[PDB]
A paper describes a structure:
The presence of DI in the –30 position of nucleosomal DNA (NCP–30I), which is solvent-facing, triggers a strong engagement of AAG, as shown in the glycerol density gradient centrifugation. Cryo-EM analysis of the AAG–NCP–30I sample obtained high-resolution structures of the NCP in both AAG-bound and -unbound states, at resolutions of 2.9 Å and 2.8 Å, respectively. In the map of the free NCP (NCP–30I), the DI in the –30 position is well resolved and forms a non-canonical base pair with the DC on the top strand, reflecting a state for the damaged nucleosome before AAG binding. In the NCP–30I, the hypoxanthine base of DI pairs to pyrimidine through weaker hydrogen bonds compared to Watson-Crick base pairs, which destabilizes local DNA and leads to a global perturbation of nucleosomal DNA. Specifically, compared to the root-mean-square deviation (RMSD) values between two canonical nucleosomal DNA backbones, the RMSD values between the damaged-strand DNA of apo NCP–30I and that of the canonical NCP are much larger, and increasing displacements are shown towards the nucleosomal DNA ends, especially at the end close to the DI. Locally, this perturbation is characterized by an outward movement of the DNA from the histone core: the calculated RMSD of the DNA backbone from –25 to –35 (–30 ± 5 positions) is 1.0 Å for both the damaged and intact strands. The presence of DI in NCP–30I causes a reduction of the buried surface area from 7141 Å2 to 6195 Å2, indicating that DI alone has significantly destabilized the interaction between the nucleosomal DNA and the octameric histone core.
The engagement of a DNA glycosylase with a damaged DNA base marks the initiation of base excision repair. Here, we report cryo-electron microscopy structures of nucleosomes bearing a deoxyinosine (DI) in various geometric positions and structures of them in complex with the DNA glycosylase AAG. The apo nucleosome structures show that the presence of a DI alone perturbs nucleosomal DNA globally, leading to a general weakening of the interface between DNA and the histone core and greater flexibility for the exit/entry of the nucleosomal DNA. Mechanistically, local distortion augmentation, translation/rotational register shift and partial opening of the nucleosome are employed by AAG to cope with substrate sites in fully exposed, occluded and completely buried positions, respectively.
Author numbering:
A (entry chain D): 31 to 122
B (entry chain A): 38 to 133
C (entry chain B): 24 to 102
D (entry chain C): 10 to 118
E (entry chain G): 11 to 118
F (entry chain H): 32 to 121
G (entry chain E): 39 to 134
H (entry chain F): 23 to 102
Write the structure that this text describes.
DNA sequence: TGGAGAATCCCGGTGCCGAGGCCGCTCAATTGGTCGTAGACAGCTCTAGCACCGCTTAAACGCACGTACGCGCTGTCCCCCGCGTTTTAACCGCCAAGGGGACTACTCCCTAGTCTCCAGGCACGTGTCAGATATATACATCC
DNA sequence: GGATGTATATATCTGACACGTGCCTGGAGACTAGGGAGTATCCCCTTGGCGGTTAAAACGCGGGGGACAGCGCGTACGTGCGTTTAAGCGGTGCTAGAGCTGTCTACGACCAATTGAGCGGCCTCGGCACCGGGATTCTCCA
């Protein structure tokens, strides 16, 4: 069974070095990541089906993030995603 | 002259506007309100007529449902008059 | 300042359709604010759906998708 | 013959897996095709949201003088922020409790 | 070959089995779609369509109208508890609301 | 592509002297599309839950049982089973 | 001695909003779950985690309903909750 | 049978204290028992449908999670 | 309680536009065969669920008392409803510019598919540190 | 101003979090192939303006009824205390059935040819909106 536990632990040690986490909190974080993933992927699928497109690009994920996430959260999430996409394209 | 008691014309209006299907807000002021709301998001934006009619139907249905909940909040406080506290109570319970 | 075009008799008619018998004088400003918040929430998603499609016109289907986005599904304009 | 294996997350500067998100997008029956930048973008968004939740959860744990995050701190993290409460309005956190709120008409004079 | 018989005809249905089948193929729901699933879903959609249309025709006959307008569909859906539960987050355009005045507002 | 002629066929099966307007046809077409999307999304979700790649008639049956309320669900399962039994035997 | 009527209620509010534990005892809720489930399917098995998930969801639902009930009773200028407040909150949410 | 009385009056009182309620009527408890019975009937009916679709005789936690996710009452902490 | 007047219901005539039927035709559903794989079926294992028993103890239950509070009643005065009059601007019809949505062709680059392989991630095991608990002192509320 | 609920500080236990290690399997590199979409005139339709007209909105005035504050009362919850009872923990026993694996076979994807069903367009007549007259509730006042 796959889970996001080591990744959430990596982000936690990236932002709070002397702070741990419990197993139930890790399960809640895994459920949160799965719920957000399902929401954004479903909204991107609906965006692709409405626009008669058969692919999901970064544009569909950006529009899904703007549609789902509230304001400042959406702005910072679009900034983080665009930064990651530019870093991924600049490095081969 | 002839003068109806307060509440008779109100109940007549309730029966008349619950029997009918028509849109109650004027069309052109609502259209201008839609364009001034949309110009805060994107400038030089056009609108189909059917989009404005869809917004008006959704907005009128939302306001009528909110007024029903507001009326029941006012009746809960042993009142007939609705105040903003009834609307705020309804949007608090709905989660808005 | 076209929120004042949502007139007080129009709010009175919408309350009559909701079965409201007697209305205070401060209802109308709150109803205009509620209508502005609701229209901002729907119109923002409609503009987002329009900008994803690379268009300048907001269609009725953009409004229908925006209303289905927060569970206010509208029957009669396509779908 | 083959070059060194570099992960797609390290090229993006991310900690969440790009490849797992790409696999879950491909088998999730979302679309017929999935672009290359979509898992990178989605992993970045998920990592940012995880970082925001863990920021406010670590602050809530520090305020209660505890160096481990329990679900109560996650509930404080989500419900004490307006946008995270808007994102998680229909979401119940197990062993999370409620925020301490007593109405002013119930408090003694 | 033989005579071309419609899949809706051998299922005893009026809704199209083939169109629902091709919409289940192209809707990106699952990788494979079985043979009896469009027949089942067409029967279900035909039943729900008949359930709304019967009460809509009864409401149109109650208002002395030969045709069905949206007001009749709104009466048909909202006056039935199961249809109001199914379509509780659905706005019928040009549908109005039911006559419902609370008892405390009527005169004594 | 619309469900107009099929809704008209069902209407003449139910109410042979009663017609339907264009806005009412649009509303009924939207109703059929919405209920189709609900049942097909539930069937896709329940296929993904049980590690299946096929939407069978059982998936549609339990999606109808999950979505529709009681008497509607019981009757809709009844015409679904009747239609599948008629289709397989003929 | 004897405290005034209301202060122990305020300390109960402070000590139960500070805690995360399940306010309903496990065995009566488990027996209620198997009593309700017997009407649908006969001779069922239940995981412990399924009953705990049901209990967490039920306690969260009842706490949110009591919050809406409390603000409904405050709207009617009362500090006592009554079943009409519960019924009004369930109507405005849409559960009735 | 008659297991709705196991949800005691102090349990409903404790839930009201968590909900911020200072004073409770005596007719609240039967109403809360009926509300809880309706909610549990809906969620357990959906979970029984889920576990009988999968040809199991055991109701799992994930079945309850999907039963609550259908009703817009998503629950974290159980693998959802 | 009767009567004046206002609103509403019923009946008939008229015109209109939109629903309903007919027809060409094209395109999507049907038919028949093939192929590979998802899933039904049998079996086995060992995991977790159910049933039962003892005990000890936290919590529920029953009862008594009294006081806070819900609720009915009364007055008052203000705010909103009703209605007539005047102003305003919405609505309908008509007419142009012109921005922009929809269709089509092509060509290219992006992404599915596959083989190979190796390193990230998962399962398991262990020591060790963070809460939980227990008790004395003193600070913060309560009446 | 005397009586309780709880911060605050020091010791000890323990079990669950975190780190180390080994295998394994899924992601990554490299290559190819083919099809999705990105980019380059035309008619619908959206916006902008003018004129008339007339329905609706704004405004002012009177008054009446309803919100709201105060007050009394009677009762029904809150709180506290003594008795009971069954939840909770620990332990044992056993047996259904969840989950995994192997086999094979039926069934659905897929492709090619055929053909009829449904869709766009067009024409027609009848259901319904509307106007006018007159009878039937229906509300308010003396």
């Amino acid at each position: 069974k796959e889970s996001y536990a080591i990744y959430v632990y990596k982000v936690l040690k990236q932002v709070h070095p002397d702070t741990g986490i419990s197993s139930k909190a890790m399960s809640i974080m895994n459920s949160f990541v799965n719920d957000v993933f399902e929401r954004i992927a479903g909204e991107a699928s609906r965006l692709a089906h409405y626009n008669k497109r058969s692919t999901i690009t970064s544009r569909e994920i950006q529009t899904a993030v703007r549609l789902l996430l509230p304001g400042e959260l959406a702005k910072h999430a679009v900034s983080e995603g665009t930064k990651a996409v530019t870093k991924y394209t600049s490095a081969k | 002259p002839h003068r109806y008691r307060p509440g008779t014309v109100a109940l007549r209006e309730i029966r008349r506007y619950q029997k009918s299907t028509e849109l109650l807000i004027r069309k052109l002021p609502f259209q201008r309100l839609v364009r001034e709301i949309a110009q805060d998001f994107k400038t030089d934006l056009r609108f189909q007529s059917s989009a404005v009619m869809a917004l008006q139907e959704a907005s009128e249905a939302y306001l009528v449902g909110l007024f029903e909940d507001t009326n029941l909040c006012a009746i809960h406080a042993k009142r007939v008059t609705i105040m903003p506290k009834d609307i705020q109570l309804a949007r608090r319970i709905r989660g808005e | 300042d076209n929120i004042q075009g949502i007139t007080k008799p129009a709010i009175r008619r919408l309350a009559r359709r909701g079965g409201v018998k007697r209305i205070s004088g401060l209802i109308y400003e709150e109803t205009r604010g509620v209508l502005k918040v609701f229209l901002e929430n729907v119109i923002r998603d409609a503009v987002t759906y329009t900008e994803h499609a690379k268009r300048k016109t907001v269609t009725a289907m953009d409004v229908v998708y925006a209303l289905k986005r927060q569970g206010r599904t509208l029957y009669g304009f396509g779908g | 013959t083959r070059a060194k294996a570099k992960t797609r997350s390290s090229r993006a500067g991310l900690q969440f897996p790009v490849g797992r998100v790409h696999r879950l997008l491909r088998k999730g029956n979302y679309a017929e095709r999935v672009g290359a930048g979509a898992p990178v973008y989605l992993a970045a968004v998920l990592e940012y949201l995880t970082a925001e939740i863990l920021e406010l959860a670590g602050n809530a744990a520090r305020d209660n003088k505890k160096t481990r995050i329990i679900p109560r701190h996650l509930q404080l993290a989500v419900r004490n922020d307006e946008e995270l409460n808007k994102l998680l309005g229909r979401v119940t956190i197990a062993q999370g409790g409620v925020l301490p709120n007593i109405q002013s008409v119930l408090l003694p004079k």
